[PDB]
Amino acid sequence: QIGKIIKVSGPLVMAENMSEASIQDMCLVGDLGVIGEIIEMRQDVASIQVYEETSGIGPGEPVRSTGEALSVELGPGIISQMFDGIQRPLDTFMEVTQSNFLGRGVQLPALDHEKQWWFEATIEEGTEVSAGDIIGYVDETKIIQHKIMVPNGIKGTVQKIESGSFTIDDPICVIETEQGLKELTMMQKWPVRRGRPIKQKLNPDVPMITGQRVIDTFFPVTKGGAAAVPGPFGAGKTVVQHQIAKWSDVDLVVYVGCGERGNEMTDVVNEFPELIDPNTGESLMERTVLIANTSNMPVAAREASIYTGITIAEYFRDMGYDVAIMADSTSRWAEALREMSGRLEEMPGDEGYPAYLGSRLAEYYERSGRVIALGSDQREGSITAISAVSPSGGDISEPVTQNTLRVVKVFWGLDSSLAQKRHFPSINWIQSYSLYSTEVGRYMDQILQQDWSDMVTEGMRILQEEEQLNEIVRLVGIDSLSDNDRLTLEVAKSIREDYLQQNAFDDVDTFTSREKQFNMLKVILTFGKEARKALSLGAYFNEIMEGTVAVRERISRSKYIPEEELAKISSINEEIKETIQLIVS
Amino acid sequence: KEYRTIKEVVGPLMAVEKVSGVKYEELIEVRMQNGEIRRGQVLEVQEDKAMVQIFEGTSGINLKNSSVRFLGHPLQLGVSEDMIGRVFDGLGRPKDNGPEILPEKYLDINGEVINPIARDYPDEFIQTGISAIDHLNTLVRGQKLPVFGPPGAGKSALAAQIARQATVLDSSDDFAVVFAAIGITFEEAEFFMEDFRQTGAIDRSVMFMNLANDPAIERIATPRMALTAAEYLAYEKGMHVLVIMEDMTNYAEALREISAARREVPGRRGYPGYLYTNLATLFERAGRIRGLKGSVTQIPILTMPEDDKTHPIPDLTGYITEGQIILTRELYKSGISPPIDVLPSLSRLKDKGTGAGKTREDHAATMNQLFAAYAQGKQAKELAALSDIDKIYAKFAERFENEYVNQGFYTNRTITETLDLGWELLAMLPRTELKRIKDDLLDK
Amino acid sequence: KEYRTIKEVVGPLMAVEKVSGVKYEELIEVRMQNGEIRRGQVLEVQEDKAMVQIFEGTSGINLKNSSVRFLGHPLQLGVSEDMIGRVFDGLGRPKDNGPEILPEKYLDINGEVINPIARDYPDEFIQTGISAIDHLNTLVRGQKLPVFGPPGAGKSALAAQIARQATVLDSSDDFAVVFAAIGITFEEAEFFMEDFRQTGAIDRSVMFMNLANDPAIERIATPRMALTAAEYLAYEKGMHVLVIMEDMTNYAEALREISAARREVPGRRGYPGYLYTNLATLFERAGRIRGLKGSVTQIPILTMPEDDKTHPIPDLTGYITEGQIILTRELYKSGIPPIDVLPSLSRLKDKGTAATMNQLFAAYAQGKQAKELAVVLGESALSDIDKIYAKFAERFENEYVNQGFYTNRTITETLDLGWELLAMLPRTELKRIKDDLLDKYL
Ligand SMILES: Nc1ncnc2c1ncn2[C@@H]1O[C@H](COP(=O)(O)OP(=O)(O)O)[C@@H](O)[C@H]1O
Ligand SMILES: Nc1ncnc2c1ncn2[C@@H]1O[C@H](COP(=O)(O)OP(=O)(O)O)[C@@H](O)[C@H]1O
Ligand SMILES: [Mg+2]
Ligand SMILES: [Mg+2]
């Protein structure tokens, strides 16, 4: 069946003779064949929201339905690829259209259907399998093992399967189902609006090593948890997401950029394939799926970006891997929703955004989490959601930030005043929070067998008391309050400048292993603690730390100590001890 | 009896043509072309035309090949004594993957309003297990006592603590709890479920779980379903039921979403005008009934915004509820657990709650005096420097807050120990300034 | 074919009936009953009906005797190498009364989206000729660097001085400037035109003039037209193009007027909800392309509404733009371009070219920090010894930043002069070491 346009008005195009199509079906609209999504339908007439631009399209032009919802192709060839909101490869787009620009009305398959991949079967013929079981694997990269698993909704018995070189379109296995015989390919199509089903969800209690000191110490995020990063103008939220993308114990990374700067996206495309794995494995781009959408892209494609990305994350989570998805930025996504809801004459909720914003954000963030994948293998996967929020003028009271914080548990709020200094992390220790501090404290205390929870509570208490001291300092001076609290200020300065302050685009400061974190925190905390034991035990009012000026430089150097030499900070701590015990007498 | 005449589908709304005998708020089933079945509800009916809203959504629906069945009854709930010890969703579907319980009967979830002459005044006492509640803001069987707090303050743990440690000093009838989660994350869901199964309180409780990612229609139906089940177990089986709801602010937000989807005229602050009545129809479902054994006590728990004038949700809730419980994140930072700020917190029915026989003869004397005691104590150290005539009161306030740090959420302080600590710590500097009628109540 | 069936006329909008083959954003010409011709644009089309908006206006139109021609193409621009050295209006019609140039081809002014893979990172340097820009907030070929200015402050003349003193210090000499006036007074338009023809910069520049009394639709089309011409000259021929735009605030005000005339659902503060995307459509057109020689650089200049809550226009512009330039009336009163370099910051200066920069920044900031408190900060002991830095900073304002609007301090000029100022302070004193850089003390 073919349709006929009867009305064109901006992104909305109405077309009659669409009785055979269904709602949320993707269609080619007009003579150019632009991609559109069916929202409404009055009798035969259907209202379609066109993704691409609609300039030059009028009535009488035909419309043809694809017959499926938003398509994502999930198979070998998806890693090391740059897609748009609709999962279209940008490199293949450039090479096929022979133009450096994205032409309107061009549709291309997501994965290389003609590329040959080596399939290795790991199951015997005759073993009954349900939806989610693994029948083979392909070594898509040297790090990631792309496991060919059964598409969802197919349950049966394996008829024949054998290893060999095949494409993603060639059948590699036959399944005897209740309906009959069905052949399975190496690529499965899934709708991005509906989340991939699982067996059972569980609490994310395994903390992630992000390599960031301020993150992994005070406000940690677990494998499967959700974190929101709202920052003023240029406080550093995108670079925080970049850091989590490069240094993280996750298996795969899905970086969705929605409505951000084209140059800032090209920076990602440039620096990702030139960074290697922390353990000296392969390139960063060989373990990352990039979904780029310029600020100037089609508003609808920007709306579908996070859904495509989270669907790919669920596809790799169903295999049993740990995936981290980074969104930049969910505020631009919410503004796309605002534009669509305003052009559809829907009842505004708060500040022009649609009232179902909270519901949509809940639907997104609840898809991420540590779950048990479907299948008899009982494998476990996780999706860590890291999202960046762009509040107008940095107002946290904005509905986007409020609705995001209503469903996430990790909040890394950035501060303008802290961004003005070198503290580009700018995570306000007083304002920010993490409900995983309890669970992460338990885990990080048990696997390391150190009193790490007490260390973290003491450091955070020092920073809170420093927030009070920041008030008590005005107009009275340093000499006024007790020398004990003066030392408290110096210890808070030590934490702020040696532990909290962390440059991201540095040679060795960009990564701080777990052992290095504990050792650096030990140096700082034991410096403060030895001074605490000494000060009330006969410390001069002008002589407190003059003899430690040569050893505090070691603390300042702790952030530049290479991770290959692990046992250096332990030599720092003992010297701290020996110096401070004898300066008093 | 199936109608295969869908005329138009606009977003979550669908119009069915050529119908007859369709009523308002009638639930319907949509048989899609692929065989998938979706539930929905009638929102409007004009002649043979009928506008409905689908719960799950409207994705992938072809209007030509789909059909609609009209069941002929509104939102119902199947009630039965086997309901204890099970976990349901917002609409009543089981989530514990347990056996399908045979319902005794189906009841409309909206219920019916109680005749003012048939309502009974609450007079009994519930031992919540918290001293700050059982002695200062006493809970009464049938009293609607809300829990206000900042986002992420001491409320999720307080809900579980009350839901476990709540009991009466009787065995006839046996106590029951109905916990309703409305628009929460899966981690909070599992927090409540795991705590219940760990302490064994799930054996005497009925849980209605509605995740935040659930549809807004189910979020609206969740508290009404919980209160319907509570009314059944109380007014028909003679059980004293304690309902605990969290969170109610999410209910209000989802209701705003509902009215935004139904294109209704938005009232004040973007919320529907009937929000006040829709909240009243849920709060007034508590109380006792003349001639019935059971009782329904309600504890709604809500997030309060800060610096946003006064939100109608806290205002209307605190006005239709007999009292309120205030807590603060400053107290959560100070280690108070449960962090209950007793200065702005007030219970309006504690007078009938306590008495001789009900709790003890001295509880009524201790309550009225502890109010002024902690007031004077805190206002002595920080009004609204150095001095001594009120420093003795200052230290009282400090230890009053510090001894509630070391108790935690796992302390089940009975009424005996509560009154014992009351008089046992009342007597350090005995003074006649305390307004007691006689000295026999000054034995502590 | 030219329909003569005008059905409805409501304000600036007009509805033509019994049409066929009309497309979205299609251009139309109205042949009035008196012979006057007026241009317009299709806003909506439904079967045999088409709603359009007339650019010039709707006064004096007789619905019975007038007719409407459908051109069959959206807003287009005729591009050619002869475009250099001419002045056009907002829609592209010649304004200097010069020879009618034959267009090589017509291009849609909306442009097309650049593939993120095809985009290249800006790495070259533009010599703007102004001290602050060249040594403190360096401009990069392809960087969108805005300019903030108080109403009637040095922002209006900074445009002309940059547009003249911009040049490339490199073998490739495919330079070209594209200046775009958006809703300005005739006195400012003549300011720019006369300055260009006086200094001779008009010979190497393309001007798109749009007066404040011009229609809001033309005001919306002006910057997109300028960027279309820039992309032609840069990505089709091999030319480094520098676009300067003033003013941006007026563009947004006219966009509000547009949506008010189209009865669209307004967002916050009366602005359209798609204002963010509509500004993105213009800011992301700058940069370089892999495999192409040219580049497009943008300098939007706007009047700040600051000292009040951040309007969506400075907010979104400063968010999408990599950096910002701040000007202050406190410096404009002292005779200083009055570029306040403390809040000014360029986020691509690393690739644009740092030792002298990081040294000068804290140096002048230390003169301001010695003046941070009441009068000169601020301890009796500090006195003249602290005044050393503030003496240097007074000279930093008096002779380094304040160069004049007709002084072309090239990279050599500005770089060599910058070293002269530090002679006020002692010579081995860069924070922080004893002898951190003895060499080339000056
Ligand atoms: N950890 C860090 N250390 C040093 N600089 C940083 C860090 N994070 C961000 N930045 C700085 O912030 C700028 C980019 O900010 P960005 O990450 O885009 O945040 P936003 O999205 O708010 O603009 C860069 O110039 C970079 O130098
Ligand atoms: N300090 C905070 N600020 C904002 N939101 C928070 C904070 N702490 C927790 N939240 C979020 O608020 C949501 C609802 O929490 P809530 O039910 O109020 O917790 P509690 O009952 O412990 O107060 C949670 O999903 C959580 O992510
Ligand atoms: Mg950003
Ligand atoms: Mg909770």
Numbering used by the authors:
A (entry chain C): 2 to 586
B (entry chain D): 3 to 386, 393 to 452
C (entry chain F): 3 to 338, 340 to 356, 366 to 454
Sentences reproduced from the published study:
To provide a structure-based interpretation of the allosteric effect, two additional crystal structures were solved. The nucleotide-free crystals were incubated overnight by gradually increasing the ADP concentration to 5 mM, and two different structural states in an asymmetric unit were obtained from one dataset at 4.2 Å resolution. Comparison of the two structures indicates that a nucleotide binding to the designed site induces the movement of the C-terminal α-helical domains of the designed B subunit and neighbour A subunit, which changes the conformation of the neighbouring catalytic interface from closed to open-like. The conformational change expands the space around the catalytic site formed between the α/β domains of the designed B subunit and neighbour A subunit. This probably weakens the interactions of the catalytic site with ADP. The conformational change suggests a structural mechanism for the facilitation of ADP release at the catalytic sites upon the ATP binding to the designed sites, although the structures are bound with ADP not ATP and do not contain the rotor subunits. The solved crystal structures suggest that the allosteric effect occurs upon the transition of the nucleotide occupation number for the designed sites from one to two. It should be noted, in particular, that the three designed nucleotide-binding sites have different binding affinities because not all of them were occupied by nucleotide in the solved crystal structures.
